[PDB]
């Protein structure tokens, strides 16, 4: 378990997990709000 956790903390794996999470969040945000060109909340 220690060695598996150490391997999971290597740079490419952490990078791909972080970027997958970011891409998913961005895609979901763009799906909920389809188009956006200016900031209209104010």
């Amino acid at each position: 378990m220690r060695d598996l956790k150490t391997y999971l903390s290597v740079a490419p794996v952490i990078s791909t997990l972080w970027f997958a999470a970011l891409a998913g969040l961005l895609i979901e945000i763009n799906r909920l709000f389809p188009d956006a060109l200016i900031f209209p909340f104010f």
């Binding site: 060695d3 598996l4 150490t6 391997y7 290597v10 763009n30």
Partner: protein, 742 residues
């Protein structure tokens, strides 16, 4: 003797080696001092010959890597089958193959990319595919999606089995060295077992499954009314109604009166008028004959018994006029190192791939394949590129062997020494041939351009002013056209419609095949092809032969295989290694393949492909302008590059828009490559010094000190980007044109 020898649990499976990167090499395993360490960790990952010196470990690693590659390939096949099963219009395309475009991919609706879902046909929207899988499935007899789903599940199961087999053969029972060094048994099993038995089983499948279903489909029966494939096996009455010979059973086969099977084993040749492809009976007959030939040929080498041949005895006992004693110590060389075998197999595979592309474009073996132009173009270009890459890699591995595995004391060969003793004459003659061929081939075009630019069209090398006709090719074409009349009485017609002589074949109002004329332009392009091939051969041979030593550097073998240079002395010694020779020959392979694919595309669009009206006239796509516009460089630039790029640049706002975007993106990448090919390391290092100072001022200095890329790394990056950009540009242009116009 021949035996099974294994070692039990040579390695123990654990995650402790996953935590520490670069465990294979001690220098890498020590730790990262600078950033270059990272760039090394991926470069030496697969160099098993440098990790250790024992052949046993290298062989075991190679076996496991092969198993993993097989698992990946099986996963890819399963994915393709699942996509065909779920997201596709195969059932709609089956009924009306001529008026429906195949599609097996569906795009989501997140950003606005839904415009990529074009109107392919059959009540479906998606991306039109050019893999040619639909024709394969139709020729196999598949008429539903449940069978495709079952095939995908089987592929997944086989991929899992391959992965488990790889793990088992590396970590549980690993074969010994003597197991791999038995080439006679391996050759016998690969010839008789892998090739003969597989082709025999495929011929049996074609006889029992493909032929009746395809006959029913060609008759006009609806795909939903065709009996299931196992009904033909279960019901002999159906097969008797279809092919009466089956009513006699297997009795004729043992009775040697094989003529009774003439109904479904024919030798007619030519193309099928209904589908524009080869007859399936001919294919089954060919597979049966090939199975017989391979099964007979698989029993040549002596293994474990008295009868057979010894490869070493055959090599040693060879006597000839020009050879002499010759092949005496080649067996040990071939059975000692992996690199020589890798080079030989790579070259053979590349040549076979090129031959496959030629034979596939010439004689279409699948139904409704000739009339689908995009599939033909994609297959031809893809197979040509793969063959070129393999042929290039063969020389690199040959140079690697000559550098690091060649010693004339323990393992000495006479032929290799004789070749190495007169390399100067070979190089000089090849250089002269390349110079002469290039001068003539390009001077003809330059003379044509100059004469046409001066208002002198009567002085050019053309079909009207000065004719240079390929007489030998025309003679061969006439002989092939007249072949089935007297020389081959068994065949009803000629093998291919390409030969000058015969009739035109068209399917569904579109031309399938017609004889191809040959003129001055074909002469010029063939000579250009020969010139490019000769230059590439010269580069690769000069790289291979002068790897160990040279007149300029007498001890080049001590420096190794991958070194940038020797120094600024001797006037300059940049790019003296064989790796640099391979990196230089990649460019010429790219050039040659690009020229070949351009020639094929223009000639096929101009002289073969087209449409036919009801009256009987044939209108080609470009109206036959190849014979008069391809004799000058301006014609190539205007009538091919400028004229045929209208579709790709005007594809914005349509379903092909993606292609257009690629047509730009690849261009960018190409330019990017130049940055890595025109500069050097010192400038970048000196700039990184100032950048690192600016970082140091704000306490954000990393422990791993940044370093500029090495010279070899920069050259590799440049060549990779160049090749990728060029190939992607050609891909986008070809696909956009052939989809929008055909």
């Amino acid at each position: 003797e021949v035996k099974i020898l294994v070692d039990r649990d040579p390695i123990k499976t654990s995650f402790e080696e996953w935590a520490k990167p670069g465990h294979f090499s001690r220098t890498i395993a020590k730790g990262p001092d600078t950033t270059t360490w990272i760039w090394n960790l991926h470069a030496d990952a697969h160099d098993f010959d440098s990790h250790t010196s024992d052949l046993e470990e290298i062989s075991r690693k190679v076996f496991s890597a092969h198993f993993g590659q097989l698992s990946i390939i099986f996963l890819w096949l399963s994915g393709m089958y699942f996509h065909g099963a779920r997201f596709s219009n195969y059932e709609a395309w089956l009924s009306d193959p001529t008026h429906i475009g195949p599609s097996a991919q569906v795009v989501w609706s997140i950003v606005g990319q839904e415009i990529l879902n074009g109107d392919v046909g059959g009540g479906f929207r998606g991306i039109q595919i050019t893999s040619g899988f639909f024709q394969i499935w139709r020729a196999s007899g598949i008429t539903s999606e449940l069978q495709l789903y079952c095939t995908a599940i089987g592929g997944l199961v086989f991929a899992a089995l391959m992965l488990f087999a790889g793990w088992f053969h590396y970590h549980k029972a690993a074969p010994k060295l003597a197991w791999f060094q038995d080439v006679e048994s391996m050759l016998n099993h690969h010839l008789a077992g892998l090739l003969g038995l597989g082709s025999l089983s495929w011929a049996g499948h074609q006889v029992h499954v493909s032929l009746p279903i395809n006959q029913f489909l060609n008759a006009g029966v609806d795909p939903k009314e065709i009996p299931l494939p196992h009904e033909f096996i279960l019901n002999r009455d159906l097969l008797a109604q279809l092919y009466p010979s089956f009513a006699e059973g297997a009795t004729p086969f043992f009775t040697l009166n094989w003529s009774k099977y003439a109904e479904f084993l024919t030798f007619r040749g030519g193309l099928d008028p209904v589908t524009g492809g080869l007859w399936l009976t001919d294919i089954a007959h060919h597979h049966l004959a090939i199975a017989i030939l391979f099964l007979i040929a698989g029993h040549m080498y002596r293994t474990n018994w008295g009868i057979g041949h010894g490869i070493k005895d055959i090599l040693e006992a060879h006597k000839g006029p020009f050879t002499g004693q010759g092949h005496k110590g080649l067996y040990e060389i071939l059975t000692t190192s992996w690199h020589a075998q890798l080079s030989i197999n790579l070259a053979m595979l590349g040549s076979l791939t090129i031959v496959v592309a030629h034979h596939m474009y010439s004689m279409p073996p699948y139904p409704y394949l000739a009339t689908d132009y995009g599939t033909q173009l994609s297959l031809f270009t893809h197979h040509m590129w793969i063959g070129g890459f393999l042929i290039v890699g063969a020389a690199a591995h040959a140079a690697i062997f000559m550098v690091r595995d060649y010693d004339p004391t323990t393992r000495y060969n006479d032929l290799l020494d004789r070749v190495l003793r007169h390399r100067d004459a070979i190089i000089s003659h090849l250089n002269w041939v390349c110079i002469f061929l290039g001068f003539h081939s390009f001077g003809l075009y330059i003379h044509n351009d100059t004469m046409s630019a001066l208002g002198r069209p009567q002085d050019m090398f053309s079909d009207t002013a000065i004719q240079l006709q390929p007489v030998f090719a025309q003679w061969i074409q006439n002989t092939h056209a007249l072949a089935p009349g007297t020389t081959a009485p068994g065949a009803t017609t000629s093998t291919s419609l390409t030969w000058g002589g015969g009739d035109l074949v068209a399917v569904g109002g579109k031309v399938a095949l017609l004889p191809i004329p040959l003129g001055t332009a074909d002469f010029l392009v063939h000579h250009i092809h020969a010139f490019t091939i000769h230059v590439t051969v010269l580069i690769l041979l000069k790289g291979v032969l002068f790897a160990r030593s040279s007149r300029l550097i007498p001890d080049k073998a001590n420096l190794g295989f991958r070194f940038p240079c020797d120094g600024p002395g001797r006037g300059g010694t940049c790019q003296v290694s064989a790796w640099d020779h391979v990196f230089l020959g990649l460019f010429w392979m790219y050039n040659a393949i690009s020229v070949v694919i351009f020639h094929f595309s223009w000639k096929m669009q101009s002289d073969v492909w087209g449409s036919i009206s009801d009256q009987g006239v044939v209108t080609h796509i470009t109206g036959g302008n190849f014979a008069q516009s391809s004799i000058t460089i301006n014609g190539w630039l205007r009538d091919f590059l400028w004229a045929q790029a209208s579709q790709v640049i005007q594809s914005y706002g349509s379903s092909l828009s993606a292609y257009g975007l690629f047509f730009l993106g690849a261009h960018f990448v190409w330019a990017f490559s130049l940055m890595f090919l025109f500069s050097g390391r010192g400038y970048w290092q000196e700039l990184i010094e100032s950048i690192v100072w600016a970082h140091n001022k704000l306490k954000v200095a990393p422990a791993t000190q940044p370093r500029a890329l090495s010279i070899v790394q920069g050259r590799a990056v440049g060549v990779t980007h160049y090749l990728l950009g060029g190939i992607a540009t050609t891909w986008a242009f070809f696909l956009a044109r052939i989809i929008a116009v055909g």
